[PDB]
Amino acid sequence: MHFNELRISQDNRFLIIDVSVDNQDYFEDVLLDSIVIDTQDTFVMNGPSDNPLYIYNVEDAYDTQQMKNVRLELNIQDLKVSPCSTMFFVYVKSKGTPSTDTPCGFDKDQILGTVINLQPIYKQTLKYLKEVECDCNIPKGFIDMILKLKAIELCVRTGNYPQAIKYWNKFFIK
Amino acid sequence: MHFNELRISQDNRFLIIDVSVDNQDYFEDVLLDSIVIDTQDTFVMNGPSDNPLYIYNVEDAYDTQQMKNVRLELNIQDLKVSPCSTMFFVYVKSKGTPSTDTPCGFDKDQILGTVINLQPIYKQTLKYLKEVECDCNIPKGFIDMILKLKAIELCVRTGNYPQAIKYWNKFFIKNNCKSPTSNCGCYG
Amino acid sequence: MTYNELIYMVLDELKLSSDDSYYTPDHVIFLLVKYRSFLLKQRYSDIKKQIPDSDYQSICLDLIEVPAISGEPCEGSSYLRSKNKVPTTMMIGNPRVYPMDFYQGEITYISRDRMRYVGYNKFLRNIIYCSKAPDGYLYFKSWNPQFLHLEKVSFNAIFEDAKEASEMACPEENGTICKLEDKEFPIEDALVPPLIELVVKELRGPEYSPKDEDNNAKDDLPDAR
Amino acid sequence: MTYNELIYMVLDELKLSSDDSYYTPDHVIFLLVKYRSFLLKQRYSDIKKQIPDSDYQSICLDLIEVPAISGEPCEGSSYLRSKNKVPTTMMIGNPRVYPMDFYQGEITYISRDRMRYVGYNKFLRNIIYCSKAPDGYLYFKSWNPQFLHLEKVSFNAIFEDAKEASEMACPEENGTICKLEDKEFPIEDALVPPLIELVVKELRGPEYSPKDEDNNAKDDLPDAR
Amino acid sequence: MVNNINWVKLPVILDRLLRHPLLTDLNLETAIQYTLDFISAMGLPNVYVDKIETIDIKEYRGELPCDLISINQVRLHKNGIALRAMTDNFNAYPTHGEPSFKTQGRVIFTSIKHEKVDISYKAIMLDDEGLPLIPDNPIFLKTLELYIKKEWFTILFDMGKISPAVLNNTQQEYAFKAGQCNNEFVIPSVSEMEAITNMWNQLIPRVTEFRRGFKNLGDKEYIRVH
Amino acid sequence: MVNNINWVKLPVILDRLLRHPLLTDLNLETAIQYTLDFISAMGLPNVYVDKIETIDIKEYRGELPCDLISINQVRLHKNGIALRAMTDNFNAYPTHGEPSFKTQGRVIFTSIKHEKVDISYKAIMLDDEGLPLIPDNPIFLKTLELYIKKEWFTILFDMGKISPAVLNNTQQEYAFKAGQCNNEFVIPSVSEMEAITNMWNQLIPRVTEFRRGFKNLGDKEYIRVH
Amino acid sequence: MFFTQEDYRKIEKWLLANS
Amino acid sequence: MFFTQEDYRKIEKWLLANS
Amino acid sequence: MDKMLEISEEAITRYFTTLSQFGYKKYSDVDKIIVLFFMEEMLAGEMSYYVTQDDYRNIVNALYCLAGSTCMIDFPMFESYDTLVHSNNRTFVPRITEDSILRSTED
Amino acid sequence: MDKMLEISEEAITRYFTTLSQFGYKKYSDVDKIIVLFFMEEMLAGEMSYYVTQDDYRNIVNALYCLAGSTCMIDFPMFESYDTLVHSNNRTFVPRITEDSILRSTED
């Protein structure tokens, strides 16, 4: 099970989630179960936390192949969070048993995808480039921002979300 | 032709390949011919080597949408190679003729995509991660690891495969990884 | 001048021309190199003077990354060492490691004892260091991780053995010189007559000494046989 | 240079080529090893001078925990010690025990008398100390119970007997050199011609001396037999 | 002090000593001892870490912190009144006033039975290893280098392995740099000269800054206009 | 200083040193070390780069800039009032006025809980490699040349490879050029002498230049005519 | 955590396992 | 795997609901 | 957890490996090893019943201070397939060159 | 673009070539390399959709400060056939020596 697109809308008003189940033959029995949204405040390592930001159960929408693909567009202001200074964690679940021929390690019910707003980062890069235009010297804040973004990338791809939030809160919010 | 999912499983077992011909009607006729796997030791500038690591002819199966899309789950132990210290070259040959009026260059019967295990490289980079916190000092290890990875990335994206092999040999050929245990770890 | 000229000058002064001679040219080579080192230390250790370029010699080194002790997470940072063992230098000249251009680069060559405590100064953190370890190789250390990428260097110094450094000499434009006898002997021409005199004095007396000639299960030297 | 080259230089200067020679190469090894220490003391004991890298050797030791006296409770804290007896260092060089990496770690080689009283300074309670006991072993002492886990150290010094420390030489990359003749002799080239001269002078006179050659139940040396 | 005490690790001195071929057998074990000797012989207060730590008094006695080297002041925790040196010879001994104190080892002998006292004391800045941490001031580094060099050359000269002229030159250089370092670490900064000026020029002298923690030693003395 | 501090690269000094064949074994490492040593020993304030940088105080503590060496002043961001040095021993420690500051390492101990302060400090002009950058004043270059030569000849004389007369001459020359350099960099220029003149001649003395950033220290004191 | 139903069924299955 | 208090509360409440 | 186990085993094995090669480890890092294994036995014992999710958050965010502190403790690696910027593999398929009253359309 | 990729590939290849010959490159130059490949990544991904023409102008004018800054980054060469002073290849073809009412006249 995987993500098709997991993006925040360019208008900074919707959080786009478009999930799908993998096309391989032995997820025929497997479906999509729920969508749980967490922020940098309510995250826990062991799956979604209690009192989450927004829970979604997918039988509610439909009345079986329609249930294998889902698309959500959440008005972020309705979630009562800041679209610019929020890092969303999007969990998904399966509620379904694959066949007995699955190769090992592929049978995992849950996934996760981190989300942030790239507009503030784009504005910071534009500001630093404007500074570079004057006298052709590289500000050190620009290199610091680049390397800290790469640090958060490494933390996310290695799954070390606690230190990822620590860096986010320490550098890209305050 | 294009690649949908080209990856090594994070458990260091399976070299995952998922090819699918383009959905545009120009390429309706063209079909996949074979899958040839090469490593940095059996690589040649043009086309696959005459001593590859694995061959798979598509036509030795059901023969049309099944022919247009093919997927493999090759186990690496059968290939007698190391998942982490190896860089695979995936060649896909197409059999057919694209209909005329397609813009040129799109009608490339052969496509190539490389593979590397990024987990051990992240393991190396985590050692220098915390240098980012420490101000007053340049995070030199972090920068060095990032540039080492991006050298391979750019040399791949520009088609400069020989220098990519040279950089892989210089940097990451001595990578270590936990060999997957044959007894399948049971969970779900 | 080459090894051949010096060797055959010593031999001709000794008149060791017959192939059936006890003292071969290898005796001459050994004595010449050891007396070279002896004369260089005798001249350039008492007080500091100018060493000409002729007593200096160059080698080519290929560097490989090695662990400090072994492959372990907590055994310390890795080093760069030459693939082959490095001749010992003489502490009389200007030893220098350069990146194949003498007039460029700063790769300091320091004492082995000093090299333990080095690089802590904030402005000395991008300087590459060298020292011939007790293993015999020339280890490299620095705090700027870029040094590990370095692949090939040269080393100029007044080496202890002229022969060892001559075997490791840099390739020339024409190519490698196969015979040691065709290589340039590393000594100034102002020191050559003393060297020839010392070596000829070394082998003059022995040249006319008696041998144990008889094959009789007996020591025949007391009888001057 | 190796033991073989020095040995055969001495032999060829003396022309002891026949197998039926009174003075065998073993005499040459003995004299060379003793005159090496003699020359090194004569040169590097008067006033402090730079010692080259050629005079040193690295031995590798395997440490074992031993009681201070016996297995009693009140007999003091235990010490580590080398499994085998260690060569005696000369007091002219830069002795150093290092943890298989010369450029890292702090193990201090001190005198026997000093090591009785070390580590009372609160900042020096984590420093490992070394000395050669009258037993002939290298004993280790510290106030930091972590030291007792140490398993291997290498000791670099100008050892007083080249043969002993060369026999204890550390394994090379290729492997151990079985024959002592193929190992490397520990001396600078500037001290080699004097060493050969001294040994050759030592055995020149005895080489041509008479023997008690008649088997007649008689001493035949007064008659120059 | 005009300059700032940026801290660096001890082997920064061995970076510099072992340039000299006659000092190549020096070690961190020797560096630690001679560095502590130099720190104490110089007695510069800017090299120590200012710390404050409260303790309780059981009966005219209190436990002292582990890292204490000197006491800037002692005061009562509740009043804030500072303590003086105890001139009394019979403090905690009865037969059949203003508070004071005395410190010898790990014990502080106050004149109060049961109270908590605040001690502002000085210690040594340590490293991640339990070792001393030295200033990187090149004057300080050069003077410490010369101290260690002078000691080692004194040993070698007692042995007869160093010419007397060499030792005389080393002692001369060390003496000049010792004076230089002493002045460098002592002469006030501009901000400290404002404190000294405010202390110096006082139409109505202030002579009771010991009761406070010398808080108002440096405040300006403002006279109203009439 | 009469002249201007035009910056030039470190290897200039090695271009000048290595003309002496007895100094051909010097390297950029030794140049860097002895250049830092010389810059610190002379302590010339015109060689350092004046910078101003604002920090925020958390609770009587603040983070200090990385390149700081000495602080000219510290003031409050909102009011602009300068901070004197701390005379207190119990600054942030409570029990059961005039602002001040104190700096030891990378931390500044001020007497204010939550405020921003401006710090005017001095650092080193650095090179694009990231190395110290020296003036081209040939008096400075000559004195640094003689400093490095004096250290090298001292080391050689310790081994016994230099005559005592040569070392004595080198020390004498370096001493004279050190005095010359100190007078070169410290004697006021014509405009600095105008500032000093306006500071000296004052019918109504000004004794509050520190509250401002010594801004009006050289301001001319005008008297109205009657 | 966010338990799914099937996990609860597993829990009661294994609890009534010692029935 | 790891449980907190709340996880046990959910599990026990869900047990009691269906008993 | 089953991972605090692995980290603790790795850390103490590295500790004793260093004490085998060298004869000294910084006690400032022995403190970190002590904290680490004390926490793991705290969480794998009878005291794991007193922890809320807020306590879990605090414990994890405090243990991550030990991650790259010394070579004995490393940053753990989890199986992750995410990133800060994701790829858009959606495809475009309009219906016979049609549009809505305002915009485009697909299948 | 397809040219930022080439410039970055050349720049990092030169960087590692220097680190092969030498063991040191200025970190003031590594900063320019970092800026360059960060821009290359950002413009060739999902972040380019926020780019206006003013943003493109500013980005190009900021990147050209990197052009001759180091040996690694070099001035790009584009296909151009122009100049500040263009040529005059027009030909004069008078007709029947005919002046117009005021001006001359050609075909």
Side-chain angles (χ1 to χ4, degrees), chain F residues 72-88:
Chain F
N72 306 339
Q73 281 214 298
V74 187
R75 74 175 186 181
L76 300 155
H77 190 50
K78 44 162 181 43
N79 284 355
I81 299 302
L83 271 53
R84 68 179 178 85
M86 261 177 56
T87 51
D88 200 3

mmCIF file of all heavy atoms in Angstrom, chain F residues 72-88:
data_model
loop_
_atom_site.group_PDB
_atom_site.id
_atom_site.type_symbol
_atom_site.label_atom_id
_atom_site.label_comp_id
_atom_site.label_asym_id
_atom_site.label_seq_id
_atom_site.Cartn_x
_atom_site.Cartn_y
_atom_site.Cartn_z
ATOM 1 N N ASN F 72 34.165 45.189 23.480
ATOM 2 C CA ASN F 72 34.311 46.617 23.734
ATOM 3 C C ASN F 72 33.265 47.100 24.729
ATOM 4 O O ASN F 72 33.592 47.800 25.693
ATOM 5 C CB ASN F 72 34.204 47.402 22.426
ATOM 6 C CG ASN F 72 35.178 46.919 21.376
ATOM 7 O OD1 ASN F 72 36.186 46.292 21.693
ATOM 8 N ND2 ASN F 72 34.889 47.219 20.117
ATOM 9 N N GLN F 73 32.007 46.714 24.523
ATOM 10 C CA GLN F 73 30.910 47.155 25.371
ATOM 11 C C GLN F 73 29.730 46.211 25.221
ATOM 12 O O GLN F 73 29.653 45.418 24.280
ATOM 13 C CB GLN F 73 30.467 48.578 25.032
ATOM 14 C CG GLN F 73 31.338 49.674 25.583
ATOM 15 C CD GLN F 73 30.524 50.889 25.945
ATOM 16 O OE1 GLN F 73 29.889 51.494 25.090
ATOM 17 N NE2 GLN F 73 30.509 51.232 27.217
ATOM 18 N N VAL F 74 28.810 46.317 26.175
ATOM 19 C CA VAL F 74 27.507 45.671 26.115
ATOM 20 C C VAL F 74 26.480 46.693 26.576
ATOM 21 O O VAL F 74 26.711 47.416 27.550
ATOM 22 C CB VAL F 74 27.453 44.397 26.982
ATOM 23 C CG1 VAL F 74 26.141 43.664 26.770
ATOM 24 C CG2 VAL F 74 28.628 43.487 26.666
ATOM 25 N N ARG F 75 25.352 46.771 25.871
ATOM 26 C CA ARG F 75 24.304 47.731 26.190
ATOM 27 C C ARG F 75 22.947 47.059 26.035
ATOM 28 O O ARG F 75 22.843 45.925 25.561
ATOM 29 C CB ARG F 75 24.417 48.982 25.307
ATOM 30 C CG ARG F 75 23.988 48.804 23.855
ATOM 31 C CD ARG F 75 24.019 50.117 23.109
ATOM 32 N NE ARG F 75 23.484 49.981 21.761
ATOM 33 C CZ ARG F 75 23.406 50.968 20.876
ATOM 34 N NH1 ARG F 75 23.817 52.192 21.162
ATOM 35 N NH2 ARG F 75 22.898 50.719 19.675
ATOM 36 N N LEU F 76 21.899 47.774 26.434
ATOM 37 C CA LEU F 76 20.531 47.304 26.265
ATOM 38 C C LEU F 76 19.998 47.747 24.911
ATOM 39 O O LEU F 76 20.224 48.881 24.480
ATOM 40 C CB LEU F 76 19.629 47.830 27.381
ATOM 41 C CG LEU F 76 20.022 47.421 28.799
ATOM 42 C CD1 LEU F 76 19.498 48.420 29.812
ATOM 43 C CD2 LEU F 76 19.515 46.024 29.109
ATOM 44 N N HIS F 77 19.285 46.841 24.241
ATOM 45 C CA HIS F 77 18.827 47.125 22.886
ATOM 46 C C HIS F 77 17.804 48.252 22.867
ATOM 47 O O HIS F 77 17.822 49.096 21.965
ATOM 48 C CB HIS F 77 18.244 45.861 22.256
ATOM 49 C CG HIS F 77 17.972 45.990 20.790
ATOM 50 N ND1 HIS F 77 18.906 46.466 19.899
ATOM 51 C CD2 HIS F 77 16.869 45.700 20.060
ATOM 52 C CE1 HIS F 77 18.392 46.469 18.683
ATOM 53 N NE2 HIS F 77 17.156 46.008 18.751
ATOM 54 N N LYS F 78 16.906 48.292 23.855
ATOM 55 C CA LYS F 78 15.820 49.269 23.807
ATOM 56 C C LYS F 78 16.275 50.641 24.291
ATOM 57 O O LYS F 78 16.002 51.655 23.638
ATOM 58 C CB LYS F 78 14.615 48.792 24.628
ATOM 59 C CG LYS F 78 14.919 48.202 25.998
ATOM 60 C CD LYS F 78 13.657 48.181 26.857
ATOM 61 C CE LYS F 78 13.900 47.625 28.256
ATOM 62 N NZ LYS F 78 15.151 48.122 28.890
ATOM 63 N N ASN F 79 16.966 50.697 25.428
ATOM 64 C CA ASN F 79 17.345 51.971 26.025
ATOM 65 C C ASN F 79 18.688 52.480 25.532
ATOM 66 O O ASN F 79 18.899 53.698 25.487
ATOM 67 C CB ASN F 79 17.389 51.846 27.550
ATOM 68 C CG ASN F 79 16.010 51.827 28.174
ATOM 69 O OD1 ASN F 79 15.003 52.006 27.491
ATOM 70 N ND2 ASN F 79 15.956 51.610 29.483
ATOM 71 N N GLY F 80 19.603 51.587 25.170
ATOM 72 C CA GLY F 80 20.933 51.995 24.778
ATOM 73 C C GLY F 80 21.884 52.243 25.924
ATOM 74 O O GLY F 80 22.995 52.731 25.689
ATOM 75 N N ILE F 81 21.487 51.933 27.158
ATOM 76 C CA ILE F 81 22.362 52.148 28.303
ATOM 77 C C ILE F 81 23.430 51.064 28.330
ATOM 78 O O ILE F 81 23.129 49.869 28.226
ATOM 79 C CB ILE F 81 21.554 52.155 29.609
ATOM 80 C CG1 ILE F 81 20.514 53.283 29.605
ATOM 81 C CG2 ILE F 81 22.485 52.269 30.808
ATOM 82 C CD1 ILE F 81 21.083 54.684 29.418
ATOM 83 N N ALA F 82 24.684 51.477 28.481
ATOM 84 C CA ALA F 82 25.790 50.537 28.500
ATOM 85 C C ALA F 82 25.828 49.781 29.822
ATOM 86 O O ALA F 82 25.369 50.270 30.857
ATOM 87 C CB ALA F 82 27.115 51.263 28.278
ATOM 88 N N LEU F 83 26.390 48.577 29.773
ATOM 89 C CA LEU F 83 26.501 47.693 30.923
ATOM 90 C C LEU F 83 27.936 47.689 31.430
ATOM 91 O O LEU F 83 28.868 47.446 30.657
ATOM 92 C CB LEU F 83 26.072 46.270 30.555
ATOM 93 C CG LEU F 83 24.593 45.919 30.708
ATOM 94 C CD1 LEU F 83 23.699 46.901 29.985
ATOM 95 C CD2 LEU F 83 24.335 44.511 30.204
ATOM 96 N N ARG F 84 28.109 47.953 32.723
ATOM 97 C CA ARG F 84 29.420 47.853 33.339
ATOM 98 C C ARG F 84 29.731 46.389 33.637
ATOM 99 O O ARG F 84 28.941 45.487 33.347
ATOM 100 C CB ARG F 84 29.479 48.699 34.609
ATOM 101 C CG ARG F 84 28.607 48.180 35.745
ATOM 102 C CD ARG F 84 28.721 49.027 36.988
ATOM 103 N NE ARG F 84 27.835 48.543 38.040
ATOM 104 C CZ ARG F 84 28.128 47.569 38.894
ATOM 105 N NH1 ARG F 84 29.286 46.927 38.846
ATOM 106 N NH2 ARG F 84 27.236 47.226 39.816
ATOM 107 N N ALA F 85 30.886 46.146 34.245
ATOM 108 C CA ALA F 85 31.263 44.796 34.621
ATOM 109 C C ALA F 85 30.602 44.403 35.938
ATOM 110 O O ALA F 85 30.181 45.249 36.730
ATOM 111 C CB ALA F 85 32.780 44.681 34.742
ATOM 112 N N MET F 86 30.518 43.098 36.169
ATOM 113 C CA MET F 86 29.926 42.580 37.394
ATOM 114 C C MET F 86 30.944 42.585 38.524
ATOM 115 O O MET F 86 32.046 42.046 38.381
ATOM 116 C CB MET F 86 29.407 41.159 37.188
ATOM 117 C CG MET F 86 27.910 41.052 36.941
ATOM 118 S SD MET F 86 27.376 39.358 36.632
ATOM 119 C CE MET F 86 27.962 38.526 38.105
ATOM 120 N N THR F 87 30.568 43.197 39.645
ATOM 121 C CA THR F 87 31.289 43.065 40.901
ATOM 122 C C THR F 87 30.618 42.091 41.858
ATOM 123 O O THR F 87 31.180 41.802 42.920
ATOM 124 C CB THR F 87 31.420 44.431 41.581
ATOM 125 O OG1 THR F 87 30.131 45.050 41.659
ATOM 126 C CG2 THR F 87 32.363 45.327 40.803
ATOM 127 N N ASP F 88 29.437 41.588 41.511
ATOM 128 C CA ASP F 88 28.678 40.726 42.402
ATOM 129 C C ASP F 88 29.269 39.321 42.456
ATOM 130 O O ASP F 88 29.928 38.863 41.519
ATOM 131 C CB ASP F 88 27.229 40.645 41.939
ATOM 132 C CG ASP F 88 26.292 40.199 43.035
ATOM 133 O OD1 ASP F 88 26.745 40.006 44.181
ATOM 134 O OD2 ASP F 88 25.103 39.991 42.734
#
